[PDB]
Each structure stands twice: as C-alpha cells, then as structure tokens.
Design a protein around this ligand. Sequence first.
Ligand SMILES: CCCCCCCCCCC
Ligand SMILES: CCCCCCCCCCC
Ligand SMILES: [K+]
Ligand SMILES: [K+]
Ligand SMILES: [K+]
Ligand SMILES: [K+]
Ligand SMILES: [K+]
Lengths: 252, 252
Amino acid sequence: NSATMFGFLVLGYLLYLVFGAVVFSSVELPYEDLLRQELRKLKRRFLEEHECLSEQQLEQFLGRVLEASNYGVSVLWNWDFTSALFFASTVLSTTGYGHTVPLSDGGKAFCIIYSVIGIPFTLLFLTAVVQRITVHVTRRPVLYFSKQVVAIVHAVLLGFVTVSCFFFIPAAVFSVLEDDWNFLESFYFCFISLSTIGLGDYVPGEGYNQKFRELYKIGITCYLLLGLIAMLVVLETFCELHELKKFRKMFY
Amino acid sequence: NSATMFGFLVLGYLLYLVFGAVVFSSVELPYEDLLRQELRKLKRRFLEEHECLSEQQLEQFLGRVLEASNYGVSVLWNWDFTSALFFASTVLSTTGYGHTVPLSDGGKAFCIIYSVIGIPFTLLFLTAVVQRITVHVTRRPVLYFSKQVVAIVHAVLLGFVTVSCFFFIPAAVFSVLEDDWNFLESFYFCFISLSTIGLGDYVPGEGYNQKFRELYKIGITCYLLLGLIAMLVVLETFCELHELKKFRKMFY
Ligand SMILES: CCCCCCCCCCC
Ligand SMILES: CCCCCCCCCCC
Ligand SMILES: [K+]
Ligand SMILES: [K+]
Ligand SMILES: [K+]
Ligand SMILES: [K+]
Ligand SMILES: [K+]
C-alpha cells in the first residue's frame, strides 16, 4: 500500500507542475504579446522617428529596451506551456534563472502562493524519490559488509559516477545542442543548475532559430529534475558516512 | 568545548565569505572596467558614428548592448568587495540573482570550486545555527507541556511571528529604501529571496544614485542570511510536529 502512496505523490507533483505551467501560461502570456508590441512599435518609431538622435534621445530608447530585457522580453517566446512548465519547475526546485519572470501582479502573486504550496510539496516529493533511490543504491554497501570502509568507497565511487553521468555527459550534450556554449560553459551551467543557484547567465533552449524547442524545454526540465534527485541521493550517501555524522554532530 | 566548535564554524564561514568576496572582487573586477569601456566606447561611436542608421545598424548596436546587460554591465559597480561579498553569499545560500555573474573563465571556474566547498560548508553552518536556535525557540513547547497541542500552537504562532517579522517588516523597509518598489514588489522580492529562488527581477541596492550603498549591500547580505536561518528554524519546527512526521513517514 506504501507503493501507491509514493506513486501518487510522484503523480500529483507532476500534475502540480502542469497545473502551474498552465495557469502561468495563460495569465502571463497576454502581457507578453502586448509587451512584444510596445517594443516592436517603439523599435520602428525610434529608427524611423529620429534617425540621427542625440545622447539624450538614445538613453531614452535604450532605457525602455533594457527594462524589457530584465523582464524576459528582448527587442531583437517566454510563456508558452512548454516553457511555462520549465518555469514552474525551476521555481519549485528553486533554481530561478530569471530569463522568464512573471510580469503582471497576478503572475507575481500566483507565483508566490504556487510556491508556498509547491516548494514544500517539492521537498516531500524529493524526500520520497531520494529515500527510495538512496536505499536501492546504498543497500549494496551491505552486500559488501569490512563495513565502514565499504561505504567510504561506495560513496567516492558513486560520486565519480554521477559527476560524470550528470555533469560531463550533459556538459557535452549541451556543448552540442547550444552553439555559443563551449564545454566549460555547458559544464558551468550544469553546476549552477543542479546546485539550484541558477544565476541565469546561461539557459538552454534560447537560440535564434531553435528547432523542436518545445521538447528541448521538456527535456531540460527533466534533466534538471533528475540531476537534483541524483545530487541529493549522493548527498545522503555522503551525509551518512560515520566520519561525517561524527564531524556534524560535533557542533550541536 | 562544544561552544568553541560552533563558535569557530560561525567565524570560519564568515571568513570564507570575505575570502571569496575578495578573490571574486579582484579577478572579476578588471574585466568589468574593460567592459565598461568597450561599452562607453561603442556607445559614443554609435550615436556620433551613424546618426540616422537603418534597421540593420540598430540590431547590431542593441545586440552588443543587451549582451552586456545579461552579464551585469549596462550601457546606461558589480564587483567591488561590498557587492562581491553580496555575490559570494547569495551563491552559497544558492539564491543567485544574476544581476552579477562571473565574467572571466577564472571567475566562472573559481565560482564552481568556491561553491563545491562553500555550499556544503554553508549547510553545516546553517545546520548548527538552526539546531541551536530551534532548541531555544522550541524548548518552550515543553515549558507548556497538553503536549502535542502545545506544539501545533507554538508552530502556527511562530510562523505568524517571523512571516511578519521577516517579510512584512522588511517588505516595508524596502518599499522605503527602494524607490520603484511598491509593497507587493518588496514583499515579492523577500519571498523569492528567502526561498532561495532568486529570479533576480528585483535586487535591492541598485538604483541610480544610491548613497551609502556599500553598507546597504552588507545589510542585505545579512537580511538574507538571517531570514534563511529563520525560515529553516520555522521549517524544522513544523517538520517536527507529530502529524507531519506521520504524513512524511507515510511514503518511505
Ligand atoms: C534544496 C537544497 C538542494 C541542495 C543541493 C546541493 C548540491 C551540492 C553538490 C555539491 C557537489
Ligand atoms: C537550502 C534549502 C532552503 C529551502 C527554504 C524553504 C523555505 C520555504 C518557505 C515556505 C513558506
Ligand atoms: K536559486
Ligand atoms: K537569476
Ligand atoms: K536564481
Ligand atoms: K537575469
Ligand atoms: K536554491
């Protein structure tokens, strides 16, 4: 019966993500179309309006252009559902790249509530997904039980596995998928993504003329999601070695 | 003797923050001065160079302007130490606004290592700071011991305390300090900050002509740091109520 509990948690979470991905999609998308216009309109009017404008005339155009940039809309789509799903997930995993921020007040507010509920929901979700994976991946230090040393080797080995399997493999996959991204950049991106730092200087699936982008988003959303679980799995496996519980306990 | 262990942890952490705040300050600052120039130079040359330039001539200037924006440098200082300290802390608390991202490869790489070491160090730091605060703030459900109900009331009461004390009070303080920020925006900022989501659409201490800014940074760095501890404190207090351990346990 415990299997249908975790099985439902996993289901409901995914839905909560689609739910939000939809609510965000709709409320925030409209303000974008209208903002896309105010920019395309202010773009045309600037060039055609005052060809040789002065220092005071440029700071006024650039201002309105940069302001649009900070909100995810560049003068040169953010809230579809494939991308709004991307946002909803990175907001509950708490990465927050920012390449897409809510624009209205409803979005901003819905985001807040959606999170108060989702963030926690997300912990529970992860806790379960990890407790389980942790055991199946760390039930083997026993098939080996000397005892303490089977773990210190299981850990360091498991680290070198996922570090490669989740950073280097995708660090390369992105060096591929994303043009302007070299390896370091792709790798660097993975680190700040799976760490949930999310500076947002780099975000995949945002290149001029990207084909099948809809999926790339859904793929990323999963890369990030799984990679996080993987980290936590590796974290538990490390946080549970004798020497660590020792070092930790040393401060309470 | 346990008091000098946590006391040193708290010390060393703070230093690790200053250490990084310095290393980042120096390596990344230079690329900024040089980038500030390439922009001030491309700014002058654009207006004076081709007053009435066409559609093809604007996309080329705006491109280089927006590209600078995404990296923290606007055409219209990011790595001093008061602000570099701000970065180092938000990177280890994992908020990552992005208003400041490392520019060189050294910065990007140092950041990664600094984090692999700091993030953990930061957990330990928090764990201690919270375990302690948790007990002194939740040793009182006992001074009240019926028993289970003294906690469900201690929790809900403590929530309403810090929610007000860390969100509303500062939500207002910012409505003050930050011009363009109304209450919702200030409050909204606090939520995504203390949640460590850090979209970065709003970052305090970044207004044209901000006086005593150096401190405002150091103040924020602390607001964020403490507010996080506060959250975790409140989180533990909630994660440890019978009904919850019950609901949680329901999935392993
Ligand atoms: C919700 C907190 C997630 C923390 C992730 C920490 C990953 C650290 C990896 C360091 C090698
Ligand atoms: C390093 C993980 C920090 C998680 C902070 C969660 C705060 C949630 C507040 C919800 C009211
Ligand atoms: K973050
Ligand atoms: K960000
Ligand atoms: K972020
Ligand atoms: K940003
Ligand atoms: K985070």
